[PDB]
Design a protein around this ligand. Structure first.
Ligand SMILES: [Mg+2]
Ligand SMILES: [Mg+2]
Ligand SMILES: [Mg+2]
Ligand SMILES: [Mg+2]
Ligand SMILES: [Mg+2]
Ligand SMILES: [Mg+2]
Ligand SMILES: [Mg+2]
Ligand SMILES: [Mg+2]
Ligand SMILES: [Mg+2]
Ligand SMILES: [Zn+2]
Lengths: 187, 157, 52, 105
RNA sequence: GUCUACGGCCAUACCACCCUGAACGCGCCCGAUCUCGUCUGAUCUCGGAAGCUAAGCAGGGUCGGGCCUGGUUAGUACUUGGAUGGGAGACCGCCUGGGAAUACCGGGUGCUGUAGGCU
RNA sequence: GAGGGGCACCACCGGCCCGUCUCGCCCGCCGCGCCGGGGAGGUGGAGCACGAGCGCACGUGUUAGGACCCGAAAGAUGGU
RNA sequence: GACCUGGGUAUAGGGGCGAAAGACUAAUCGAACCAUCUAGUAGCUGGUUCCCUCCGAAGUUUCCCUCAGGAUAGCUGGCG
RNA sequence: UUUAAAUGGGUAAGAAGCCCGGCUCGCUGGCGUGGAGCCGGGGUGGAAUGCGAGUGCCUAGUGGGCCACUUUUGGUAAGCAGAACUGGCGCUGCGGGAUGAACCGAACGCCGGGUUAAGGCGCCCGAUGCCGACGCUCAUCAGACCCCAGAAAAGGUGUU
RNA sequence: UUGACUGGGGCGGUACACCUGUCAAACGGUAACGCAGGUGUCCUAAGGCGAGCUCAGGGAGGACAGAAACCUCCCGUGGAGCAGAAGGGCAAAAGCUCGCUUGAUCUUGAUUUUCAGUACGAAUACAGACCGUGAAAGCGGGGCCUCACGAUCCUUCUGACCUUUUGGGUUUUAAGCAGGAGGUGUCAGAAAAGUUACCACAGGGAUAACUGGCUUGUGGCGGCCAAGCGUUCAUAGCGACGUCGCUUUUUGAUCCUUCGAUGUCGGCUCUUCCUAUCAUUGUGAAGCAGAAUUCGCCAAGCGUUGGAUUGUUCACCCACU
């Protein structure tokens, strides 16, 4: 015998996608070749996001992408996201930016192209920039889900703000004791 | 079962020690506590208002709040399988300045004045401290006399 | 009987609900039945407009 | 437990200390046609017997006695509730005690 | 060389007794008309300057008592960790490290800040 | 070497909306009032701060149903 | 002899009948038998069906008519 | 209880630090005071050893335990009742203690060579079949290896 | 419907909510039907603030007057008092006396304690008001600190010139919002008498009544010491005050095995075993003249009966030996 460990020692990341999509498997064979052969960390971040779940790959609206590329310096780089680009109705004009994504939506890819932009896939991203040089890779808000605001301490805990599971929001549904100082206590 | 009451096991620790009773001296009140000061908790027995709890007597925390008569102290407390940063309001007579960092605030002073003291002179002073090394190969002297012979004494009652 | 964080649910199954169950297995066969009742009526009032 | 007959306390109407007439709070005639009395009457009525618990396992011997402070200065007439820790015997206006007393049992 | 007013540390500063105390001061001291307070100008409050180092107060003394500090007690008593050590047990010795307390004996006995005065 | 722009996320500060509380002055008129609107501070909310949901499938967990299987002493209804 | 006995006839289930033993009422009686409600309920006993690989417990906290049971925190695994 | 250990508990051993200059304030206030906040600027080698860390969701089983040193309570005592610290058993085979839940060694994929641990080496039974060293001991009830499975006070001109 | 805990259950007690000292092993935590006690109150002052004062006890004096009356002087580090249980704390004081008072009032958050780090209760540090007291600094939102208490629903009272009362108005009522009270002591909170030997079910060796086991207080049977008793004479025979043991034929104590069952007293019948020997064999010692007894040794070979009363084990009596 050697030590007294608790045996973590099996790393619990993903080595391939659980998806059986054969187009997405060809991107992995494109980029796990590039990741082990080009000595760039762009192709290690893109390769580990092609592995990720649909939950860990959130969508990115078209108004964050033009908000995070009107920063100083970003004027002639490419928008990279391993994930989908939905549009904002809220935005009024679109610039002529160059993007790259798995799966831009129909209304969003009509509005980029009217404004003079250019959509890419990860195939023609690899032929343009193999190292990932001149790219701004982005991500959507992965804690933007409604699931994450039920997560926290516990709703009855003091200073919690944790949104309990109620079947219907309204009066008489979890508002009487433990929620106001009159009926018993407030938490 | 075992009387979960405040001020329970404090027959001797909320007691003034011996022959130091009476009204408390006045330099205790003339102590200046600012934010981030490292203070250590020791509840007295004469002043009755702001004694913390027996959980914190002997422990050492950091000031985040300064009030008219008291000081807000964040201390680490050991609950069962984890520690917690608890913020306890303690009056000014139950705390004092902890000297526990003041041997580090001396050797950040005498280190930086000695760092530039060799920068202007070009040496390799190696101001990082080492623990007690094994002893140097020295050379004892037994000049003239002889090493005194001692023997184990007999047994008696 | 409950557990950690979940809904607090009131399922209305405390009654003899298995004798009153309705299975829509005839609902294809009633759609072609009420089509034929529209067709056989549309030619019975033959010149008149359908849907009355 | 002896409290005085008048008392100079805060009244929420004007935000001042000004004297009050303190008497004892009595419970009051239990009104019919309240919502839980209307409910208990249409529940108890019929067959079925007693339909709600009647408490019988009584332990305490005192009550928290409560005072009602009545703001004496006119066209205010502001009343409010003030409690005292519980007591067996409660005088309300009598016998301020003096310590020069021959008291002998 | 000391003091007065205010202090910090609160006995090396206290306690009992005995000597000494220039000059300023501190004080005892002499009075109740006012201010004020009493059973009582004793205290407390108020007017002073006729006397006094007698006391307080300050220095010093005592093979002083305590107090402070150090040896001795003692590597003793306890104790960490260890042993297929001993012993019928109670308890014990050793290994590896840490290490007291009383009697007994020795030495000390106020130190200082701010402001003002004497010499 | 250094510098720059900083995704997501985390911590903090600031702001915003709704309820209440203290403090205060100003503004508007389908008509001048036991009217309407605004301010500044502190607080209560499952909030805003450039959206992530929906439908479908599967896996796990829990619950209601005979509910993993078998087991009472009973109670009731109508009869012989 | 308050005798023994046949066939006829009457009384039925919280009812009957009892010189009283809770006796007897079709081998069933301190509440019959048949069918249904019904697969009633059980924190309680018993059982719970193929292989290999990897990780791996707890018998403790707090509350409960709680003490052969739960809820809660700890311990675990899985997913990232 | 004056004194007062050993063992133990907290904290500190840096850039989230050190220093300089400036601006805000409705707080503080003799004071351009005090303190907070804010902006800009200056220089990183700051105990030993070891280690890759951080964080979120979902979550089963369990909620009768028992044992041994050490420290302890009740008890005459108990393979008794109840606690503290650590290890183990339960969940765990293997070598040894003849026997065995927990002792002592050591933890385990399937095998070959080597070497040991605890324990042993007359014969069961592997290995003293050594020309082993020094002493002690005679029992008509000898003795014989942690836990551990049997003894005391008292006594002997028995022998050393 | 007929509480729970429980060295089985019951009776008893409350370890069922709580506080003090100890256990507790020098931070904190820590169990038992462990030990020593306490609580369900009391207080318009025993709350608040300021002033002046010093306590318990002792010594020495003073008409009655003495251990204890009141008066005075001296000593007096808390030996007093602080409402009550303890522990801590306190002297121009937190104690005594006096003068004023009501902060024991209004309001929002945070923090602490138990703790899951939920609530109640208790508490701490503030802040915004309105006040008290003091010359002022200040102190004060109950008691010198550690305890003195209580959800939902329902009810009651108070609060705003509030909100809703269902087509629109007015009014009464009712419902709301905000916070006090009327309780759950099984104290995180049900609404509750028995009996069963006529009894039934699900279980439980988690749990008694029997043996067996650990233990030996107790019962028994032994030693060691020797003040004595024995005319004298400690030890022929005994032996106090002690003190060390054994045994498991007494009774307990415990709860390991057994609750899908180990047939539970006594007697009768019958076999074997033990020795701590009553008798029989061989012996040693007497306070052994003989006879008879008594005390030890090797020794369990061989015997240890017949009856009356009693279910008896045990007892007790008659008779034989
Ligand atoms: Mg006069
Ligand atoms: Mg006068
Ligand atoms: Mg005079
Ligand atoms: Mg003099
Ligand atoms: Mg003199
Ligand atoms: Mg002197
Ligand atoms: Mg001396
Ligand atoms: Mg040791
Ligand atoms: Mg060992
Ligand atoms: Zn008023």
């Amino acid at each position: 015998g050697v030590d007294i460990r608790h045996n973590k020692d099996r790393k619990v990341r993903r080595k391939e996608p659980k998806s059986q999509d054969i187009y997405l498997r060809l991107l992995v064979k494109l980029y796990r070749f590039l990741a082990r052969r080009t000595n760039s960390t762009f192709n290690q971040v893109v390769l580990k996001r092609l592995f990720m779940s649909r939950t860990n790959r959130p969508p990115l609206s078209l108004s964050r992408m033009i908000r995070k590329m009107k920063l100083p310096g970003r004027e002639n780089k490419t928008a990279v996201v391993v994930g989908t680009i939905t549009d904002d109705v809220r935005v009024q004009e679109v610039p002529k930016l160059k993007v790259c994504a798995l799966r831009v939506t129909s209304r969003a890819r009509s509005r980029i192209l009217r404004a003079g932009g250019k959509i890419l896939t990860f195939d023609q991203l690899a032929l343009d920039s193999p190292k990932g040089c001149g790219t701004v890779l982005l991500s959507g808000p992965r804690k933007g889900r409604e699931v994450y605001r039920h997560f926290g301490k516990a709703p009855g805990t003091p200073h919690s703000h944790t949104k309990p599971y109620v079947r219907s929001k309204g009066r008489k549904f979890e508002r009487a004791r433990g929620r106001r100082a009159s009926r018993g206590y407030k938490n | 079962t075992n009387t979960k009451g405040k001020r329970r096991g404090t027959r001797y620790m909320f007691s003034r020690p011996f022959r130091k009773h009476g009204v408390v001296p006045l330099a205790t009140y003339m102590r200046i506590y600012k934010k981030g000061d490292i203070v250590d908790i020791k509840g007295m027995g004469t002043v009755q208002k702001g004694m913390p709890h027996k959980c914190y007597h002997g422990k050492t925390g950091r000031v985040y709040n300064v009030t008219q008569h008291a000081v807000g102290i964040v201390v680490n407390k050991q609950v069962k399988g984890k520690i917690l940063a608890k913020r306890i309001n303690v009056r000014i007579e139950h705390i004092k300045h902890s000297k526990s960092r003041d041997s580090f605030l001396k050797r950040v002073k005498e280190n930086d004045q000695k760092k530039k003291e060799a920068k202007e002179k070009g040496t390799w002073v190696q101001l990082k401290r080492q623990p007690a090394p094994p002893r140097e190969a020295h050379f004892v002297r037994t000049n003239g006399k002889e090493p005194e012979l001692l023997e184990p004494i007999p047994y008696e009652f | 009987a409950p557990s950690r964080n979940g809904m607090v649910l009131k399922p209305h199954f405390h009654k003899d609900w298995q004798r009153r169950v309705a299975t829509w297995f005839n609902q294809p066969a009633r759609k072609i039945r009420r089509r034929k009742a529209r067709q056989a009526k549309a030619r019975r009032i033959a010149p008149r407009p359908a849907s009355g | 437990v002896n409290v005085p007959k008048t008392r100079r306390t805060f009244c929420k109407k004007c935000g001042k200390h000004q004297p009050h007439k303190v008497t004892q709070y009595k419970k009051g005639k239990d009104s019919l046609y309240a919502q839980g009395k209307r409910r208990y009457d249409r529940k108890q009525s019929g067959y079925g017997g007693q339909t709600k618990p009647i408490f019988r396992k009584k332990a305490k011997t005192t009550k928290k006695i409560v005072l009602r402070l009545e703001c004496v200065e006119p066209n205010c007439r502001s009343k409010r509730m003030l409690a005292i820790k519980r007591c067996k015997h409660f005088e309300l206006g009598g016998d301020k005690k003096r310590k020069g007393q021959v008291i002998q049992f």
